[model samples]
Target: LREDLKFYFMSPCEKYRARRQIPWKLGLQILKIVMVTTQLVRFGLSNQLVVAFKEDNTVAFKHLFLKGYSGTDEDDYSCSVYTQEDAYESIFFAINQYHQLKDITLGTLGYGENEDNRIGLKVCKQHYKKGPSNETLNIDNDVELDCVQLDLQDLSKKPPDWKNSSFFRLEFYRLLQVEISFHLKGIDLQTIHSRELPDCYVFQNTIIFDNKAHSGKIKIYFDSDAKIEECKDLNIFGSTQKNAQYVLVFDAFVIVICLASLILCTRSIVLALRLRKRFLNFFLDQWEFINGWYVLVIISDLMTIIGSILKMEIKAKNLTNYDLCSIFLGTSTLLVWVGVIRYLGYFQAYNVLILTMQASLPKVLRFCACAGMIYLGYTFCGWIVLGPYHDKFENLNTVAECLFSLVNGDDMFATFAQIQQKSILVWLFSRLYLYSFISLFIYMILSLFIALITDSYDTIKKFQQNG
Candidate 1:
């Protein structure tokens, strides 16, 4: 492992990393454009613009540049460069550096089917300052501007007193970085949205920032209204569609299997019923009841598959009907395991184990019954006392579920905190209840239950040996 690590960083991996970093085969298709809007504020002018890009490199960008106010022709402005072979790496790296400097979200660039230009950009501005921290060297500040510039068309349309007008107050921030990409062949440009850009075609594929440098303060600000949720919804939709298709295919296979088993089990049960004339005789027969449970399991398995098919695979996706089928399906599914145990009882060793469990059950049940009464009393009181505050105890059914969850080690300390906030008496009762419950149910009662099983196992083995 040490030698492999040494080989990995020993200059040989640089070429490999560079080649795999970005794919130039596809045109850039991962870019989206953000709508630009400006508004006047009370004290000063407030303006914001957002450009969005898809997370993946499914969208392509031709180039990005900015036209200077002094330039006559569009070519006079700064633009991005693209080489015939591998200019994509340079462009991607430049954009990455630009984002790292500015409050921008970084995205990959790729080739898309659409020839038209669609760009995605994100911008964030700090609105608040953080308090003193231990990391003095890491302190930062908000973005600042020197002088703002406008396009010739914008300047022509400005009012005579535009300079004096409070609405036109412009503070410029220096342009930090820009991205320029080359257009690939077979790009479809018509699909791109027709949005207006300032400064003729010079700003076609460019970004310009004001040339200003000032002391910065680091203030933490987040865009709470960002379109992050939409991306998540789109991904979730894609995966759900894919998974549902696979599940439907698998469910169909399981349904066919269960149906075949059901037929054979039903035939066997019919033959047994034909042999036994008396109802009590058939009832007393162990195999008869075991086969009945097996049939129930097959029916439940069939229903579960059918329910999932109707709910997920079908066009209607009837959730209500699916849930109605699920209750009986789930119960019978559990009974399938019971049926398995019964089937195993045919073997002498397993038969002894089953009989031992039966013998031990009465003692375990009696102890549980007593513990259950105490548990029920505490559950009712806890729900009544903590229901208003804690979500776990919102109702009787939820309280019951929460109590069972305790055996699996749910956050009991959180419940303790909730009770502690209410009052001393409530806190005391909660503490006592927990200690008593753990001592009685978990430590004492459960240990005794295990002991009963062990005791029965020994007695059953001795009897079998004697017989």
Candidate 2:
């Protein structure tokens, strides 16, 4: 450990301590960038770029913008119905409730006081203003989503029926919700329609197509309706601008800070290389002479630099690497914070963890290797035999995770309870297998594991005291 501390000035470890300022400097800048990055995310949320929904998802739309929802009746509790029938029944309930609106003059639903509490069935379709017969237009002149609301003043007693309907599309559950009901027929669908029937169906936000006999039309609120419902307002904070320019400017600062970090790391590496050539006897073949912390910080800087740039690209209409950018930023912040442990090695009281781990890391890995061979034996044993009786041991992967978690003393009794107790011989062998693995790993291997690290700590302390 002492020999490995060489950094190639007159007395090498002294120069190593001098170079330690690089990490201290880099750490605080990263702290600021982390703080700034969070604010930048807040700004992105305000700008409305990130939170979007697939326009076709009907179920998410169901929960959004409604008169609120409650669960179905207790009869639904028996697992008595298939999901397809269950869903169709929900549609039927919608029509039944709508009938109560026009049926009673007072129009009370769930003990309502006024007739105005209910709304009449209105079908409003988004219509584009007339352009001269096939007149050329700019690319910006796309389909609009708003038109005036029009209602069916009177509807027949025969309501919209999903059960006996011919055009009850599987698409009713998925995409572009549209209905070609019988009442919509004489209304001349061609004149006020958008081009390409199957391509893009543009309907107004509150449109309902109603036909007199068994109104087969089912309406979804809005995949986009709940979008507005789901999106949260960050609230206008003082005189702040709702633009990505502020976020971009902060990310630019992040890039500059990373640049400064890179400069220092490259300088340290080059100086270490220079020493290897100058003092061949002491430092040659000691790539261990170079700080591993430098390698990690350098790697972390590269990630932040790219990640910061990626954030800027997303802000600049280069959109949607939200997942990728977040990954780089978070993991690099983690590595940077962990790297601060290097500076702790300067203090006598604090350096204990670093020194102890360095000495015992190889020892720990070696011990775990021997334990893993035995662990694998137990894993294979459980997967083949007890698998038939137990779900946890049903797969080789799960068997490994299950036993690994057991060795950590998690859910010890639950694992025992889950195995089928019906088969006597297999259950007897199962207890034997679990007991040996748990005891072997916990009492023996685990005890020795700590002993190895304790021995290293004592050895390192002895060296420190003697010095």
Candidate 3:
């Protein structure tokens, strides 16, 4: 399902309604929608999708998706609750096998292991021999193992790290939903972006492991992409006597954003072209304007390809470790915008485009305002968002640290931790990574794309009048 889910968002109205009605619950609403697709399906747009509700069918989905936990007490485990749908699936499966039999029980199930045993089977029983003396003590004697129910598939939950995560969010019925919690505290916080917490506790719902057991993390399902690994803090309980299932519903949102963005740009270009008389002379002198814009577009597209290299899994290190490459990409992106404004400023005079430069002066002003905002971002954003960095390295930070250092300058590349600290490759890569595709090379292309749309419109208008 991880590989199959498509983009999903709740509608704005739904979000508004949810906010007003269930002000306390933050993650649910209409269309607890989930989209499931494949790579081949996404390639062309007409893809078959398996949409599911975020909350189980049994539960009223008007409220938000609450954190799943287990155990009678907080120290036990995160309890699991079943949605109406989860109940439906479990009942259906159980009945199919037990037709004509009536030992039906419906409730949450519980499954876990202790310090020495780590097996993840729905049920496990074994003997523990006393140290040195060969006195044998059975695990069953120490703890009363509960009835085992098999429904790990429905019980799988989100990774501990995705709390409050917006980067890969999905929209259901038009409203955006983000996970904001920590699942692991020992792990470094910098590994995830758009984070508001320090660790990954989202997975604390129910975890169980034992030392003498399988001894390693185990999978919850057959699919590698959709399985849960073992954790030391284990507390998973649904029901002991009868088969119980806790189904977690997730909505994929990337697909929708992809399709929408593609459509917006493509349609905008077509519209601008139909009204060609609006931007002519602007197209005559610098074909490079158009060329550069598209070139930037192609480059941005390349960045998309680069992102695919690692199978889209950004690890613990590269998550926020912006290096020189990101810096270059960021600055180069700014340059792309500068080129775009120059193109627009020139093309507007002749009215050869749909909304020639002059006609869209208001919009241009807005764009300029946005540009100023982006500029102000670099100038003062550190003070606000990066207060820690600013406070730590205030005045000691030179022009090298303040301005020129931003683009991963060559001199900056040569420096070490300080005169007292240095490494050629590490320093070089540091700057290189910072300015890599993210900053100059990557998003610079995105700026060019915005420029491309603006420039294409100008060219269309010019070509129309001349023809």
Which predicted model would earn the best lDDT? 2
User: Can you write out model 3's per-residue Cα lDDT over 436-464, one digit (the tens) per residue?
Assistant: 52365235634654675677676667766
Query: On TM-score, who's better, 1 or 2?
Result: 2
Ranking by lDDT: 2, 1, 3
Model 2 lDDT tens row, 233-337: 223233322445767887787778777877888897887766665556544244454767878888888988898888788767534337887788777777877
| lDDT for 30 (candidate 2) | 54
Off by over 4 Å in 3: 1-109, 114-203, 206-227, 230-284, 287-290, 310-363, 366-467
- Residue 229 of model 1 has an lDDT of 14
lDDT of each: 0.40, 0.54, 0.30
Give the runs in model 2 whose Cα sits over 4 Å from its true position. 1-158, 167-241, 281-287, 318-321
The residue-by-residue lDDT of candidate 1 on 330-400, one tens digit each, is 45445544555644664557878887877887777787788678778768976897777677788888887
Residue 137 in candidate 1, Cα distance off native in Å: 54
Model 3 lowest lDDT segment of ten: 218-227
Candidate maximizing TM-score: 2
